[PDB]
Amino acid sequence: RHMELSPDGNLKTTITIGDRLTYDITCNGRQILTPSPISMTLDNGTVWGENAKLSGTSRKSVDEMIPSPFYRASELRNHYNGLTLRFKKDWNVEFRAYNDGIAYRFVNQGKKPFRVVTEVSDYCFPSDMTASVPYVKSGKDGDYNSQFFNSFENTYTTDKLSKLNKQRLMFLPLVVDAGDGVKVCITESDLENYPGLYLSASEGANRLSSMHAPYPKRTVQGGHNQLQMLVKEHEDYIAKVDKPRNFPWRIAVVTTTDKDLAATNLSYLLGAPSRMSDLSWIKPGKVAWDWWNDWNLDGVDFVTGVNNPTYKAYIDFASANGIEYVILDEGWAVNLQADLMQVVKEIDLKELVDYAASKNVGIILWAGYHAFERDMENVCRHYAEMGVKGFKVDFMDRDDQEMTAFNYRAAEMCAKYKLILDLHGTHKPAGLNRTYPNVLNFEGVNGLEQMKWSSPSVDQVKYDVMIPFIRQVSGPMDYTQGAMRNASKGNYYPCYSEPMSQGTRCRQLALYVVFESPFNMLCDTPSNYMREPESTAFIAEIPTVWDESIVLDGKMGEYIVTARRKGDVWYVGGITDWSARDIEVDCSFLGDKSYHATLFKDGVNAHRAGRDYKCESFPIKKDGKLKVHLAPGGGFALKIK
Ligand SMILES: [Ca+2]
């Protein structure tokens, strides 16, 4: 029995080494997590955790700053008390107690190669608490191998642990409401070459249990235009290990106010350190995206589509407003060939890249999984040398050891040729952006692309106020916002070629502050942006990377207000759910000089016409108390310079 407390002493975990290896969690004297078992089963029969044999322990207290480029601040504070448990048989379990979380990880110091059959990571709660979880969207109930093949894109289901579907997996992160304002957010970081952790309500009462996708023994090409490698057969173990190594951290974020949940840096702090020395070539920025708006420009003299004159228009729009990139989404490579070297007749990559270059615009290429990793080294070298700045690799739809290994290999391969990377059709970041700073964004989020086909029952507005406290806890999101067509309550309808967002114009603007996206999209058509000078100017100028971030206030699934600083310029964004609300922005975070503010707030009719907004300018200072009204599904965006 070993105790460890957070630096402020209000969060503690008791670890017991008995017939089972368990750890609980107590917050301000209240037990929010009952003793929960953890273990790893090897192919040789060994089971770390079962009647474990303790050989030694070492404690430590650390307080330092971790550099965090292309993220929410220049650096993040790493403050905790660590407890490492060494066990007879060359294996350890490291425990850390931060003021906002308890985390642990298995460490393999053994020198002999072996395999992991299964891993146990239970979360036993003292009562039937209300959980907010993202179910795996595909597959059928009970057929877990059917579920392992998924996009990791889904809204949240909020219900009591006892009422959760006991036959459907839940991916991370997820939250459990411990009551009395306390929240527990479960996630994992440093997910390199190891299967992703799913949670299940299939076992016991008030208990979430883990499960991992088995190792693949036979994969076949197929899926989305033959760009996917489906797992047809799997091994009887989840992971291969042939060197000493740290295993992924299992993180239990614990907060007493929702704003601390949205602000927690645990995911990044627990990611494997950066393996990059030179970062001067990594350029974060925005994209005059093409796909979301379906190339649907109007007011032009040529037929739009995946062709040269269309991308020239996107490049010109981007350049005209200082926007950094233009992505050539799915369509530039001959379909079904899964060959990145076969460009369509209508596209002249070389001409586009060079034209873009003369306009100070970088080019990013979209690539389906298989077509990219089948000849990765050659692809990265070839396009890097012709001028391409990076890739958007999509449709992995897997998180078994081989795929998670891929994420890091691609990250490294891109880094080698000075290319940035954006991963789609993937799972939560889990620290990868710290290890390889060139991976500027990750999907694994039910983004605005869903508005192209979702039925009105999909509550995007509600989702927006959920993810800042859940999915974003794991890392950056490529949500792809920026819609100029805005639907107030009941006016939304899926429109593939002329999509809209739910809520108001200012909600869209606020997301550029509320959501963290180093590589950020301007989802709408340049045509729509040019019809909206004021909105476009605000979006084009706002940073995607920051020096300092402060979540001013918030309640999960209800609202959030966040202030971020870039140099000496401050930005504040706020959003609400379908309920209108009045927020007060205390500007005590400002410096001493006199500032000029530019505010975008919902128009007085934003509740009936979502596009309705009002722009205002006025002087403001450190003592200012800005009162702002947010319409239903609305929000506000503020610039203080
Ligand atoms: Ca997607």
In this structure, what CATH number is given to the domain that contains residue 602? 2.60.40.1180
Residue with tokens 């109930």: 141
Residues 128 and 209 reside in one and the same domain: yes
Residues 24 and 116 reside in one and the same domain: yes
**Beta pairing partners, 390:** 364, 420
194 backbone dihedrals φ, ψ, rounded to 5°:
-160, 145
- Residues ≥6 apart with Cβ < 8 Å to 31: 24, 25, 126
CA–CA separation, 603 and 608 (whole Å): 10
Residues 302 and 243 reside in one and the same domain: no
Residue type for position 83? L
| Pairing of β 75-87 and β 91-98 | antiparallel
In 3D, which of 168, 189, 186 has the Cα closest to residue 177? 186
Q: Measured between alpha carbons, how far is residue 349 from residues 331, 356, 451, 463 in Å?
A: 12, 10, 30, 37
Choose the final residue of a domain: 245, 272, 299.
272
Residues 540 and 575 reside in one and the same domain: no
Question: What phi-psi label fits residue 389: left (phi over 0), alpha (psi between -120 and 50 degrees) or beta?
Answer: alpha
Cα-to-centroid distance, 385 and ligand 1 (Å): 28
| Pairing of β 325-328 and β 362-368 | parallel
81 backbone dihedrals φ, ψ, rounded to 5°:
-120, 125
The answer to whether residue 449 is catalytic is: yes
Number of structural domains the chain divides into: 3
Cα-to-centroid distance, 152 and ligand 1 (Å): 9
Residues 257 and 117 reside in one and the same domain: yes
CA–CA separation, 460 and 537 (whole Å): 25
351 three-class SS: helix
| Residue 629 CB burial class (10 angstroms; 0-12, 13-18, ≥19) | middle
Question: Which of the following is catalytic: 394, 399, 400, 402?
Answer: 394
Q: Answer whether 136's CB lies under 8 Å from 282's CB.
A: no
209 three-class SS: strand
Cβ count within 10 A of residue 626: 18
Choose the final residue of a domain: 250, 272, 294.
272
CA–CA separation, 383 and 357 (whole Å): 14
The answer to whether residue 394 is catalytic is: yes
Q: Answer whether 324's CB lies under 8 Å from 282's CB.
A: no
Residues 518 and 601 reside in one and the same domain: no
Q: Measured between alpha carbons, how far is residue 479 from residues 48, 122, 244, 423 in Å?
A: 39, 31, 37, 12
Distance of CA 357 to the CA centre of its chain: 30
- Residues ≥6 apart with Cβ < 8 Å to 139: 145, 146, 147, 148, 149, 150
In the chain the first and final C-alpha atoms are separated, in Å, by 54
CA–CA separation, 122 and 250 (whole Å): 10
| Pairing of β 420-423 and β 439-442 | parallel
Cα-to-centroid distance, 23 and ligand 1 (Å): 37
Q: Answer whether 623's CB lies under 8 Å from 585's CB.
A: no
Residues 237 and 301 reside in one and the same domain: no
Q: Measured between alpha carbons, how far is residue 491 from residues 145, 171, 260, 336, 609 in Å?
A: 38, 31, 34, 37, 9
Residues 540 and 590 reside in one and the same domain: no
The secondary element (H helix, E strand) that includes residue 218 is strand 216-222
The response to whether 351 counts as a known ligand-binding position is: no
CA–CA separation, 180 and 254 (whole Å): 12
Tell me the structure's resolution in angstroms, rounded to a single decimal: 2.3
How would DSSP label each residue in 20-70? SEEEEEEETTEEEEEEEEEEEEETTS-EETTT--EEEEEEEEEEEEEE-TT
Cα-to-centroid distance, 208 and ligand 1 (Å): 27
Using alpha carbons only, give the angle 369, 375, 378 rounded to the nearest 5 degrees.
125
CATH number, domain of 406, equals 3.20.20.70
* Rounded (to 5) percent helix, strand, coil in the chain: 20, 35, 45
How would DSSP label each residue in 424-487? -S----TTHHHH-TTEEEE--S--GGGGGT--TTS-HHHHHTTGGGTHHHHS--------SSEE
Residues 255 and 296 reside in one and the same domain: no
Question: Which of the following is catalytic: 4, 397, 449, 516?
Answer: 449
Question: What phi-psi label fits residue 181: left (phi over 0), alpha (psi between -120 and 50 degrees) or beta?
Answer: left
CATH number, domain of 134, equals 2.70.98.10
Cα-to-centroid distance, 136 and ligand 1 (Å): 14
Cα-to-centroid distance, 604 and ligand 1 (Å): 35
Choose the final residue of a domain: 485, 520, 545.
545
CB contact burial 158-183 (16+ within 10 A = b; e otherwise): eeebeebbeebbbbbbbbbbbeeebb
Cα-to-centroid distance, 423 and ligand 1 (Å): 10
The response to whether 534 counts as a known ligand-binding position is: no
Cα-to-centroid distance, 192 and ligand 1 (Å): 22
Residues 139 and 246 reside in one and the same domain: yes
Cα-to-centroid distance, 456 and ligand 1 (Å): 19
In 3D, which of 463, 475, 530, 466 has the Cα closest to residue 501? 463
Q: Measured between alpha carbons, how far is residue 114 from residues 108, 238, 245, 263 in Å?
A: 10, 11, 12, 38
Residues 583 and 528 reside in one and the same domain: no
Residues 349 and 264 reside in one and the same domain: no
The secondary element (H helix, E strand) that includes residue 396 is none
| Residue 236 CB burial class (10 angstroms; 0-12, 13-18, ≥19) | exposed
The response to whether 385 counts as a known ligand-binding position is: no
3-state per-residue secondary structure call for 181-194: CEEEEEEEECCCCC
Domain, as residue range, for 222: 1-272
